Design a protein around this ligand. Sequence first.
Ligand code: MGD
Ligand code: MGD
Ligand code: SF4
Ligand code: 4MO
Length: 697
Amino acid sequence: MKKVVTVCPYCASGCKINLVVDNGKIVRAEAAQGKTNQGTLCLKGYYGWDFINDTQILTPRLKTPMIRRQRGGKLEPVSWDEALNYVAERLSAIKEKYGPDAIQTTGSSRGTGNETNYVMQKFARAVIGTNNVDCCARVXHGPSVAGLHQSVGNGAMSNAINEIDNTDLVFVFGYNPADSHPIVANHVINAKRNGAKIIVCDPRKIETARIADMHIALKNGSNIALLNAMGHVIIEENLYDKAFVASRTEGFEEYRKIVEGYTPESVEDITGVSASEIRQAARMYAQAKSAAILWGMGVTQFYQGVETVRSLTSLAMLTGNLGKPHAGVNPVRGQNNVQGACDMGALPDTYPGYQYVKDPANREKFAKAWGVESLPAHTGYRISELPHRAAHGEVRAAYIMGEDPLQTDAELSAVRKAFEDLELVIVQDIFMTKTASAADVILPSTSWGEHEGVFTAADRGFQRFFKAVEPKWDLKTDWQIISEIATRMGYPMHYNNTQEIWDELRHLCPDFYGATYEKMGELGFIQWPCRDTSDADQGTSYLFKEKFDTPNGLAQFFTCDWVAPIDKLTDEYPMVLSTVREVGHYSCRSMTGNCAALAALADEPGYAQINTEDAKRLGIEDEALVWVHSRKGKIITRAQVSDRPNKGAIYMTYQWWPEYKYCAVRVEPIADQRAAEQYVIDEYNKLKTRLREAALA
Ligand SMILES: Nc1nc2c(c(=O)[nH]1)N[C@H]1C(S)=C(S)[C@@H](COP(=O)(O)OP(=O)(O)OC[C@H]3O[C@@H](n4cnc5c(=O)[nH]c(N)nc54)[C@H](O)[C@@H]3O)O[C@H]1N2
Ligand SMILES: Nc1nc2c(c(=O)[nH]1)N[C@H]1C(S)=C(S)[C@@H](COP(=O)(O)OP(=O)(O)OC[C@H]3O[C@@H](n4cnc5c(=O)[nH]c(N)nc54)[C@H](O)[C@@H]3O)O[C@H]1N2
Ligand code: SF4
Ligand SMILES: [Mo+4]
C-alpha cells in the first residue's frame, strides 16, 4: 500500500489529494496538506476517483483507437498504427490542398495537464503551421480575460486564494463558491472568521449569503445598473482613493461622467435594491482597509458580461484595491486547469507565458527553439467559431482533444452539423462521449490517475500531480499521441516524460522559468511569475505591486450604460431561467457520473430550483417532473422547490445529457407524472446503450 500525491481534476480550487494505491489499483483517496485545501476535500475529490476503473455506469472509458471509414459509419476498432497513420496523412493532405489554417486543434482544461497543452500548441504552430489552437473551457470567463486584460493587463486572479482569509471585506459577485469551489468557500468563511465583512451580490439566497454582512439580491440582469450606482456613491461621497486614482489609473473622468446619472434612487426598480442598501454596500466596500472582489459566470455569461467585469474592476481601481495583498480583482474560474491550458498557450494569439505571436521577437525565439524557419503571426480561429468556419469551408478538419462540444456548446445541433460539414473530425478523449461518438477517428488517451504533469490552480499556482496507476489497456498520453502524429507528418517529436516538456517550455517562458519540478515537489504551490530557479523565488502571490501590466502601466477605467437583457419577459414566458452549479456532480458528467458514490447522488433528468411561492401558483409540487417552455425550447426537469431561488426566476443546471444566465421561459406542471418518469428512464436508457453500442463495437 502506498500513497501517490495528486491534484483534484474537478474544479480550480487545486486541492492536493493522496491517492492510496494497493497492488496496482487505487483503493481510495484522502486529502493531502496542499496549500489551498490543507487536509480538506469536498465530495468530488473524496469520492470522484472511481471513474478510472471503467465502471460503465454512464459511458465506457476508451480502450482502442477507432475509425469510421464512411460517414454512415460503423466506428470500428483499429490499431494505433492505422489510426495515427490515417490522421497524419489526412492532415497532411488537407494542409497541402487547402493550407494549414484549414485545420483546427483544441487544448484541454481537464486532467491531461499543462505539458500536453504546450505540445498541442507546438503541434499546431511548428508542425501544421497554424495559430488555430484554442480552449473551449476558456469561456469559464472568456470575457473575463480581455475585459479584465484591458483594465489591468492580466486576466488572472490578481491575488492568491490563500490571501482571501485576511481580507477586511469579501465582495462576492455572481459567484457561489459553496457549490462551485468548496475549498475556496472555506477560505471565505475563514475570512469572516478572522473578522472580515462579507457582501454577496446575487439574486438567489446562496449559502454564502447567510454569513454575509449584506446580501444584495439584485434582479437577474441588473448588473451594470447596480455597479454604476455603487461607483456613483463612492465618488459622490468622496470615498475613492485619490492618490491611487491619480498616480495609477486612467479613465476616471469618463467613468465619473457615466456613473453620475446612475444615482441609487434612479436604479432602485431596475435592481430591485433600495437606494440605502446600495449606498451602504458602496460605503462598506469603500471603507474597508483592504477588500477583495471574487466573481464567476453570473458576470461573464451575459451580453454585458465583458462590461460587468471591467465595471467591477473599476470599483477596485476607485478604491485602490489592487497592487496589495488581501485585496484584488479575482475571477475564480471553473476547471482544474483552465488556467494552465491558457498559461500553456492553447489560445490562438499567444505562445505559452503570454508571449503574443504577433511579436516578431517572440516568433524568432520560438521558431529558433523549434528548429523551424517561420512561425505564423496572425491569430488563429477560436473553437467557438467552428460551426461557422466549417459551414463556409474555411476549416476542413477539427482535432478535438479533451472537449465535449456535442454536449457542452450552445445549441448542440449547430456543432452536430459542423461535424457534418468538416471533412475530418478526430476526437481524443478518455470516454465515449457524445462528441467522440460523432467522430471519424477516436484516439484514446490516459486519464488523470494514469499519468503525471502540472496543473495551474485558479490563482495561477502551479502544482504537480503524480501517476498513481498504470493504464490497463494500450493507451498513450495525449502528448505521446500528438508527438507521434507530428513525427509521421515529418516533424521529429518525442518526449520520455512530462519533465522533458516542462523544462523545454520553462526555457522559452521567462515568467515560468523558476518553477522547476523540484521546487513544486509533492506539495509546493508555485504561483507565476516565478523567474529565478533559486529557492528564494517561490512565485508571486499578488500581481501589480509596482505597475499595472497595461501598455503604459496604468489600469484603465470603464463602465457603460445598463442595457436590459435581450429576452423580454412576456405574459407567455414570465420567468427568468438561469443555470447554476451543485456539488456531487461535475459539468461534463463523464467522470462524476462514472463514480459509483457520486452517481448515487444525482438524479435524471436533473433539478430546477423553483421558488416556493412560484411553484404554488403554477401548481408545481416538489420532486415533480416539469415542463420548461421557451421559443423552440421545451425541457423536462424535476422541481426542487425552495425559498432559495428568487421569485420570478428558475435555476436549472446544465450538467445533464451568449446570455446563458438569463432566458425567458414558462414552467408548467405535468399531470401524467408516471408517463413523464418512464419517458426519462426511456431516453436515458436510449443514450446509454447508444454510447455503449459505439464503444463496445
Ligand atoms: N452551452 C454552453 N457552453 C459553454 C458553457 C456553458 O455553460 N454552456 N461554459 C463554458 C465553460 S465555463 C466551460 S468549463 C466549457 C466546458 O466544456 P468542455 O471544455 O467540453 O469541458 P468538459 O465537458 O469538461 O470536457 C472535457 C472532456 O475531456 C475529457 N478528458 C478528461 N480528462 C482527459 C484527458 O486526460 N485527456 C483527454 N484527451 N480528454 C480528457 C473528458 O472525458 C471530457 O470529455 O464550455 C464553455 N462553453
Ligand atoms: N460542483 C461543481 N462545481 C463546479 C462545476 C461543476 O460542474 N460542479 N463546474 C466548474 C466550472 S467549469 C465553472 S465555469 C464554475 C461555474 O461556477 P460559478 O462561477 O459559481 O457559476 P454559477 O454557479 O453557474 O453562477 C454563479 C452565481 O451567479 C448568480 N447570478 C446569476 N445571474 C446573476 C446576475 O445577473 N448578477 C449577479 N450578481 N449574480 C447572478 C447565480 O445565482 C449563481 O449563484 O463552477 C465550477 N465548479
Ligand atoms: S474543492 Fe474542487 S479541487 Fe477541492 S476536492 Fe472539491 S472539486 Fe476537488
Ligand atoms: Mo467552466
